[PDB]
Curated annotation (Swiss-Prot), chain A:
GO terms for molecular function: structural constituent of ribosome. The gene is rpmI. This is Large ribosomal subunit protein bL35. Belongs to the bacterial ribosomal protein bL35 family. Transmembrane segments: none annotated. SUPFAM superfamilies: L35p-like. Coiled coil: none annotated. Signal peptide: none annotated. One of its GO terms (cellular component) is cytosolic large ribosomal subunit. Keywords: Ribonucleoprotein, Ribosomal protein. One of its GO terms (biological process) is translation. InterPro entries: Ribosomal_bL35, Ribosomal_bL35-like, Ribosomal_bL35_CS, Ribosomal_bL35_sf. Part of the 50S ribosomal subunit.
Curated annotation (Swiss-Prot), chain B:
The keyword Ubl conjugation does not apply. The gene is rplD. This is Large ribosomal subunit protein uL4. GO terms for molecular function: rRNA binding; structural constituent of ribosome. The keyword Ligase does not apply. It comes from Thermus thermophilus (strain ATCC 27634 / DSM 579 / HB8). The lineage of its organism: Bacteria, Thermotogati, Deinococcota, Deinococci, Thermales. Part of the 50S ribosomal subunit. Belongs to the universal ribosomal protein uL4 family.
Curated annotation (Swiss-Prot), chain C:
One of its GO terms (biological process) is translation. Keywords: Ribonucleoprotein, Ribosomal protein, RNA-binding, rRNA-binding. This is Large ribosomal subunit protein uL15. Transmembrane segments: none annotated. GO terms for molecular function: rRNA binding; structural constituent of ribosome. Binds to the 23S rRNA. Belongs to the universal ribosomal protein uL15 family. Residues 44-53 have a biased composition (Basic and acidic residues). Residues 1-60 are annotated as: Disordered. It holds the Pfam family Ribosomal_L27A. PANTHER family: 50S RIBOSOMAL PROTEIN L15, LARGE RIBOSOMAL SUBUNIT PROTEIN UL15M. Part of the 50S ribosomal subunit. The keyword Isomerase does not apply.
UniProtKB/Swiss-Prot annotation, chain D:
The keyword Ribonucleoprotein applies. Belongs to the bacterial ribosomal protein bL20 family. The gene is rplT. InterPro entries: Ribosomal_bL20 (IPR005813), RIBOSOMAL_L20_CS (IPR049946), Ribosomal_protein_bL20_C (IPR035566). Binds directly to 23S ribosomal RNA and is necessary for the in vitro assembly process of the 50S ribosomal subunit. It is not involved in the protein synthesizing functions of that subunit. The lineage of its organism: Bacteria, Thermotogati, Deinococcota, Deinococci, Thermales. Keywords: Ribonucleoprotein, Ribosomal protein, RNA-binding, rRNA-binding. One of its GO terms (molecular function) is structural constituent of ribosome. Pfam families: Ribosomal_L20 (PF00453). This is Large ribosomal subunit protein bL20. One of its GO terms (cellular component) is ribosome. The keyword RNA-binding applies. GO terms for biological process: ribosomal large subunit assembly; translation.
Length: 61, 202, 150, 117
RNA sequence: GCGGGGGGAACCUGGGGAACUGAAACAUCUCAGUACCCAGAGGAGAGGAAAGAGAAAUCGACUCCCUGAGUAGCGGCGAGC
RNA sequence: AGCUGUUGGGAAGCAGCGCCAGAGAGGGUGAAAGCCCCGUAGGCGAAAGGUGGGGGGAUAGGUGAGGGUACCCGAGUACCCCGUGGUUCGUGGAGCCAUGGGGGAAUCUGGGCGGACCACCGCCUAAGGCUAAGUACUCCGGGUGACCGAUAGCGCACCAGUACCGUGAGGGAAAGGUGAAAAGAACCCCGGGAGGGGAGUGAAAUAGAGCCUGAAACCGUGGGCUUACAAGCAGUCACGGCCCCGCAAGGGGUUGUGGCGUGCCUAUUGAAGCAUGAGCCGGCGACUCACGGUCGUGGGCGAGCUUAAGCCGUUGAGGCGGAGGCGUAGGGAAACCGAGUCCGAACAGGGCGCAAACGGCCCGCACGCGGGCCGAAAAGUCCGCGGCCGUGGACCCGAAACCG
RNA sequence: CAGGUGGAGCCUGGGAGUGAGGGCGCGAGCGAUAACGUCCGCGUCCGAGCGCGGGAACAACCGAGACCGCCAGCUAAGGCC
RNA sequence: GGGGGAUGACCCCAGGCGGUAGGGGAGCGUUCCCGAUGCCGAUGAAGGCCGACCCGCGAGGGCGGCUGGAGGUAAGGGAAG
RNA sequence: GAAGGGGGCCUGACUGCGAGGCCUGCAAGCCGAGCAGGGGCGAAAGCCGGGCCUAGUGAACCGGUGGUCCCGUGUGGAAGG
């Protein structure tokens, strides 16, 4: 039957125009009473590598 | 292809047709595959170990019996047991691209014209649905039953007349299909049937 | 042309891979599954795209796309679809969001918004919204109304 | 359509059972014991074809090393003789010559020790 | 006086209603309102003529198919639904 | 609408001249028949019973405007609260519909709903009931099959839910075929019969009823070669003998001696292994299908590609159907903007994004240009094929168990 | 920076199997300067070369990488009563 | 692989060609469908039993004899119990 | 030739970023010039995005708290995000 999109994946991952899988950055909202401002600041998105191939495959649809 | 011979009681004129230049034997084959696929009845079935008649009871203990090791006798290892991966009813049809159905129908006719085995005719004259009457007209037209003919006409009576000839497959104009063209050596339509076929393509 | 003449082109019809037959077939006995355990077993493995063998997977990243929706559901609101100037450069006469569907660019559920990329044309273009770049690009040639009725 | 085993299996069994003609006991009656035996016979022949070449040369040598031992000579030297004598003949196989053509062998014995004595 | 009673392959509605299994353990969740038990109906049964939909000054009973859509959402926000 | 001749046990085969066809589907007839038989195309047919959704006809029933009055408009109901179910909603901001418990109205200025609540703006009139058709199924009858063909197909082609097993619920098999025709072997001989031998029937009797074909394991009788001082996975390579075929050279069979030689499968670092499995033979026995996905590949059409359900048509004829889907724009949680966008105070920086490929014919200066044309090719999309994946029993067999 | 055209290298993608190794040499730890012990490192072979020669016989020591045929020749290890 | 323009399946030339798990490529055969209102078939179908013969590397395909006594099915394709 | 000891002012235990790399199966971990804002110390050159360095640590989910633009299920709010 129709395959099912993985809502866990859809809620925390985005596929870009060129088929890249772009996720947020781990480890910045829970224990930072003081990590370097450089640390907490360097939290934009990143690109998963050769294994978004798998993430891609559970969103397809 | 343009050199197609019309046939009137006045004289064997010549009609010019658009008909594609070259044919695509693959596309032609693809249409035939489809035509014969869809008409498939898909009516072959078998019973799985769950659909067989036998009880679900385990046949012997499982240990110390000195015998082998089994559950129910409906298992495929057993003679008279279920059938693994056997056939079930299924639909062999698919939806071949319409733009392709056209093409193939066109090319199929073309190919016939390209070899001159195509012929348009008018009103016949050997109508009033009687095979002997048609058979008489057919003669005066060249069709001597030396090669198979696909007779395409809307006229009910002409078809009645030809139907029974072992060398004639007769068909209505809206029934034009490529498989029937390719089975039959000659292609014989009337004008009120070339018109419909003409509007089918394009 | 003849029935014994049809056939297709080389490929198009490959020969299925009949494995688990006899040796020198290439794939006999172990039927290409190679001895093994779980994967070679019938039902086989869990699901490679997710399962990582017991360790936490990459369900360890935190959703951002905050705003996942709540229970009454998606909120109705006008969806705008952008079509470029280069795209409608093929038309001459009018150009209405209605016509642009038939053409195969608009899509029926969306309102019209023409965008920059492309060069403008001296025609009357009816839409719901115009891009900065687009409003300018064509103001130098043709005229264009904004929509908001019914 | 259902393609039953039909006739195919009996045929393959007949083919091999025929190759196993004359074997001992079941090795010629049971398709299985027959096929096992043929495996063996298949490798033996192959190996024994490569060593039939050995077994003959071996024989030729013994035959020679005896005919020229009649004329006071080690096979080992005899061969060295012909090597230097330029005589790349003998082809060891051709020492039925030493048996069919004794005088022709004797003359070779002479040309043999003639060089390097 | 009239009627009921009991039976029928499957199909239908109602009253009840599991577990294995899945979650690579497990309890919420799943399997599943399934299997099954009971009552009732008929050639079908249910449903049906808005105290309805839900953003369009919109549509108009019910049933059924295609689509909408694996969307909207639900979810130890896990499996999955 | 067909007769003759011919071979044959048998003609429908072959041959010679014909004929029908709205009928050349098919099945029979001694073998292979349009025209012999039964049918087929095309027509026709109900006294009686059933049906009758179609045509007709009845009957029930139905149909007014304005003004005033405020009479009626479904109660343990709405409503609220507690406990739960249903919905995609698992207590969630939790509405809606349902309701076990408590409290408990109103009658158009009344009440319910639009996802807590309030306002506003709208929708609808709860607590009575019925309602064809489009839908589901297949005990039953029929028609079709790139469905099975007696280990298959239903468990059952055969007096099978039988024999048989079980206290019972229940379980549950095996088992088809002489011949065209019984013409199914009078009589005689051996025998108590059984059986056989002649005779006889037959085209055939190793078609004789334990009957079509009659494979293999397995058991015999006869013949050739071979063997009682030799020892081994039984073979193999050599030579030699003896037997057979052939003019011939050559080959077939057997085996005396010599050389070489650790079964098959499985599982293992490693097996002849004293590790697993197998007495042998025959038959059955395991990578599938659907729907999605992702690649590749054969084609169609390409800024487009394609229909779904249905409708019409149909000697196994196709066509229509544009709802819809994918693609043509991305970036952002979003508002939003957009070839850009997001972070940002930034006109830093960076993230993720946009950039028409060839030939050739036209021209602005000539060897391209600059942009266009003519069609090669192609983003994309559609169908087929193949690999693989997701979900399903998902390669087949096997538990200990759990629950009704 | 040069040589090196190789079943070399690199890039994008489809399909995998393996994730139980073992002997030997050399270098260490553990052990007893024990184990056909055990754990690493660098090599090699067996694995998959239980094919061929030598080592009496013998997966991994020596020789040597078996496409097929020959009643031809040269050799390797090892041998030549 | 490089040649000789036959462009294959031709002749040259030179190289590679042990192999388990596995990847890839070509083929053989079985059942069924189109090819079939056809063709083979009683002067003998399928199946069976021989063969020292022919073709193919091989899976196999022929051919001939005996048995059998009514079916079988090319070339080229298509689908799988 | 300070990273050690003493004192003076100060809070860069900054905000917005980040070329390029280290490491690396993933996810992480690490170093970092430079630009901008607004600063600190210094005459200046300049240094400053904690500590001579290498341990002092915890993905995601679920919630709490303070902000802020953003969404707010007919609409304005509100609930909740
Ligand atoms: Mg710190
Ligand atoms: Mg059963
Ligand atoms: Mg039963
Ligand atoms: Mg069962
Ligand atoms: Mg049971
Ligand atoms: Mg036993
Ligand atoms: Mg049975
Ligand atoms: Mg069965
Ligand atoms: Mg398919
Ligand atoms: Mg279809
Ligand atoms: Mg259709
Ligand atoms: Mg006909
Ligand atoms: Mg293949
Ligand atoms: Mg392979
Ligand atoms: Mg292999
Ligand atoms: Mg594999
Ligand atoms: Mg195994
Ligand atoms: Mg293992
Ligand atoms: Mg194992
Ligand atoms: Mg299983
Ligand atoms: Mg499993
Ligand atoms: Mg753990
Ligand atoms: Mg089989
Ligand atoms: Mg022999
Ligand atoms: Mg040699
Ligand atoms: Mg020499
Ligand atoms: Mg009743
Ligand atoms: Mg009843
Ligand atoms: Mg009852
Ligand atoms: Mg119920
Ligand atoms: Mg129920
Ligand atoms: Mg009840
Ligand atoms: Mg219930
Ligand atoms: Mg449970
Ligand atoms: Mg699962
Ligand atoms: Mg579980
Ligand atoms: Mg589990
Ligand atoms: Mg457990
Ligand atoms: Mg449920
Ligand atoms: Mg009942
Ligand atoms: Mg009905
Ligand atoms: Mg009804
Ligand atoms: Mg009702
Ligand atoms: Mg009403
Ligand atoms: Mg109404
Ligand atoms: Mg939440
Ligand atoms: Mg559910
Ligand atoms: Mg006669
Ligand atoms: Mg006759
Ligand atoms: Mg005739
Ligand atoms: Mg007919
Ligand atoms: Mg006969
Ligand atoms: Mg017959
Ligand atoms: Mg005939
Ligand atoms: Mg014939
Ligand atoms: Mg007939
Ligand atoms: Mg005749
Ligand atoms: Mg009729
Ligand atoms: Mg009558
Ligand atoms: Mg009638
Ligand atoms: Mg009547
Ligand atoms: Mg009526
Ligand atoms: Mg009426
Ligand atoms: Mg009236
Ligand atoms: Mg009134
Ligand atoms: Mg009034
Ligand atoms: Mg009311
Ligand atoms: Mg309420
Ligand atoms: Mg309330
Ligand atoms: Mg409540
Ligand atoms: Mg609930
Ligand atoms: Mg919860
Ligand atoms: Mg919630
Ligand atoms: Mg709720
Ligand atoms: Mg609830
Ligand atoms: Mg409310
Ligand atoms: Mg309520
Ligand atoms: Mg209540
Ligand atoms: Mg009111
Ligand atoms: Mg409402
Ligand atoms: Mg609201
Ligand atoms: Mg409340
Ligand atoms: Mg309403
Ligand atoms: Mg009512
Ligand atoms: Mg009703
Ligand atoms: Mg029936
Ligand atoms: Mg069959
Ligand atoms: Mg049959
Ligand atoms: Mg039987
Ligand atoms: Mg049976
Ligand atoms: Mg049989
Ligand atoms: Mg039945
Ligand atoms: Mg049975
Ligand atoms: Mg019976
Ligand atoms: Mg009993
Ligand atoms: Mg009994
Ligand atoms: Mg029988
Ligand atoms: Mg009979
Ligand atoms: Mg008969
Ligand atoms: Mg007597
Ligand atoms: Mg007798
Ligand atoms: Mg007799
Ligand atoms: Mg006679
Ligand atoms: Mg006879
Ligand atoms: Mg007799
Ligand atoms: Mg016989
Ligand atoms: Mg017999
Ligand atoms: Mg017979
Ligand atoms: Mg018998
Ligand atoms: Mg017969
Ligand atoms: Mg018999
Ligand atoms: Mg004997
Ligand atoms: Mg002695
Ligand atoms: Mg002796
Ligand atoms: Mg002995
Ligand atoms: Mg021996
Ligand atoms: Mg001999
Ligand atoms: Mg001989
Ligand atoms: Mg010996
Ligand atoms: Mg021997
Ligand atoms: Mg020996
Ligand atoms: Mg084992
Ligand atoms: Mg072991
Ligand atoms: Mg072991
Ligand atoms: Mg033993
Ligand atoms: Mg043991
Ligand atoms: Mg053993
Ligand atoms: Mg074991
Ligand atoms: Mg085994
Ligand atoms: Mg045993
Ligand atoms: Mg036994
Ligand atoms: Mg067998
Ligand atoms: Mg698929
Ligand atoms: Mg695919
Ligand atoms: Mg119709
Ligand atoms: Mg897509
Ligand atoms: Mg967008
Ligand atoms: Mg987005
Ligand atoms: Mg901002
Ligand atoms: Mg901004
Ligand atoms: Mg910028
Ligand atoms: Mg960029
Ligand atoms: Mg193209
Ligand atoms: Mg394409
Ligand atoms: Mg599978
Ligand atoms: Mg089982
Ligand atoms: Mg119980
Ligand atoms: Mg270099
Ligand atoms: Mg390599
Ligand atoms: Mg690569
Ligand atoms: Mg891959
Ligand atoms: Mg492991
Ligand atoms: Mg390990
Ligand atoms: Mg190790
Ligand atoms: Mg190793
Ligand atoms: Mg090693
Ligand atoms: Mg050793
Ligand atoms: Mg040493
Ligand atoms: Mg040691
Ligand atoms: Mg060891
Ligand atoms: Mg070494
Ligand atoms: Mg291994
Ligand atoms: Mg070795
Ligand atoms: Mg090696
Ligand atoms: Mg060994
Ligand atoms: Mg050895
Ligand atoms: Mg040795
Ligand atoms: Mg050795
Ligand atoms: Mg080699
Ligand atoms: Mg070599
Ligand atoms: Mg030498
Ligand atoms: Mg030496
Ligand atoms: Mg020695
Ligand atoms: Mg070439
Ligand atoms: Mg070569
Ligand atoms: Mg190889
Ligand atoms: Mg390849
Ligand atoms: Mg084949
Ligand atoms: Mg046919
Ligand atoms: Mg004939
Ligand atoms: Mg005859
Ligand atoms: Mg014969
Ligand atoms: Mg057959
Ligand atoms: Mg043969
Ligand atoms: Mg035969
Ligand atoms: Mg005969
Ligand atoms: Mg055939
Ligand atoms: Mg055949
Ligand atoms: Mg074929
Ligand atoms: Mg099978
Ligand atoms: Mg200090
Ligand atoms: Mg200080
Ligand atoms: Mg970086
Ligand atoms: Mg750290
Ligand atoms: Mg520190
Ligand atoms: Mg969790
Ligand atoms: Mg929160
Ligand atoms: Mg949160
Ligand atoms: Mg707002
Ligand atoms: Mg709403
Ligand atoms: Mg609101
Ligand atoms: Mg909050
Ligand atoms: Mg907030």
């Amino acid at each position: 039957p129709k395959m099912k999109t993985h809502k866990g994946a859809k809620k925390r991952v985005k596929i870009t125009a060129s088929g890249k899988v772009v996720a947020m950055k781990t480890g910045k909202r829970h224990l930072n009473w003081q990590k370097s401002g450089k640390e907490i600041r360097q939290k934009g998105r990143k690109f998963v590598l050769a294994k978004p191939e798998a993430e891609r495959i559970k969103l397809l649809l | 292809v343009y050199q197609i011979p019309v046939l009137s009681p006045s004289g064997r004129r010549e009609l010019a047709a658009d008909l594609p230049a070259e044919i695509n034997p693959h596309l032609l084959w693809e249409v035939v595959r489809w035509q014969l696929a869809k008409r498939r009845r898909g009516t072959a079935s078998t019973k799985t170990r769950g659909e067989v008649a036998y009880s679900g009871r385990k046949i012997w203990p499982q240990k110390h019996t000195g015998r082998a090791r089994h559950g129910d006798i409906g298992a495929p290892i057993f003679v008279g047991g279920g059938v693994v991966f056997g056939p079930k009813p299924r639909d062999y049809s698919y939806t071949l691209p319409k733009k392709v159905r056209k093409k193939g129908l066109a090319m199929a006719v073309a190919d016939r014209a390209r070899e001159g085995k195509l012929l348009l005719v008018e009103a016949f004259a050997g109508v009033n649905g009687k095979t002997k009457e048609f058979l008489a007209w057919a003669k005066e037209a060249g069709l001597d039953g030396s090669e198979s003919v696909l007779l395409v006409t809307g006229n009910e009576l002409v078809r009645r007349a030809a139907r029974n000839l072992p060398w004639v497959v007769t068909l209505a104009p809206e029934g034009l299909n490529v498989y029937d063209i390719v089975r039959t050596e000659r292609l014989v339509m009337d004008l009120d049937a070339w018109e419909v076929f003409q509007n089918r393509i394009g | 042309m003849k029935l014994s003449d049809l056939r297709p082109n080389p490929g198009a019809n490959k020969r299925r891979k009949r494995v688990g037959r006899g040796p020198g077939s290439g794939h006999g006995k172990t039927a290409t599954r190679g001895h093994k355990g779980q994967k070679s077993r019938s039902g086989g493995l869990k699901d490679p795209r997710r399962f990582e063998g017991g360790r936490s997977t990459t369900l360890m990243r935190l959703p951002k796309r905050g705003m996942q929706g709540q229970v009454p559901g998606e909120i109705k609101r006008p969806r705008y679809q952008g079509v470029n100037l280069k795209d409608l450069a093929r038309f001459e006469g009018e150009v209405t969001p209605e016509l642009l569907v038939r053409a195969g660019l608009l899509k029926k559920g969306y309102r019209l918004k023409i965008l920059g990329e492309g060069e403008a044309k001296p025609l009357k273009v009816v839409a719901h919204a115009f891009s900065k770049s687009a409003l300018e690009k064509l103001k130098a040639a043709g005229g264009e109304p904004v929509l908001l009725e019914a | 359509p259902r393609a039953k085993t039909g006739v195919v299996r009996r045929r393959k069994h007949k083919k091999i059972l025929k190759l196993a003609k004359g074997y001992w006991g079941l090795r010629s009656k049971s398709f299985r014991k027959a096929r096992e035996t043929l495996f063996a016979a298949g490798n033996y022949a192959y190996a024994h074809r490569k060593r039939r070449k050995r077994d003959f040369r071996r024989l030729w040598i013994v035959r020679i090393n005896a005919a020229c031992r009649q004329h006071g000579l080690n096979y080992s030297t005899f061969i060295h003789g012909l090597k230097k004598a330029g005589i790349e003949v003998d082809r060891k196989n051709l020492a039925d010559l030493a048996v069919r053509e004794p005088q022709v062998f004797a003359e070779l014995v002479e040309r043999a020790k003639a060089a390097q004595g």
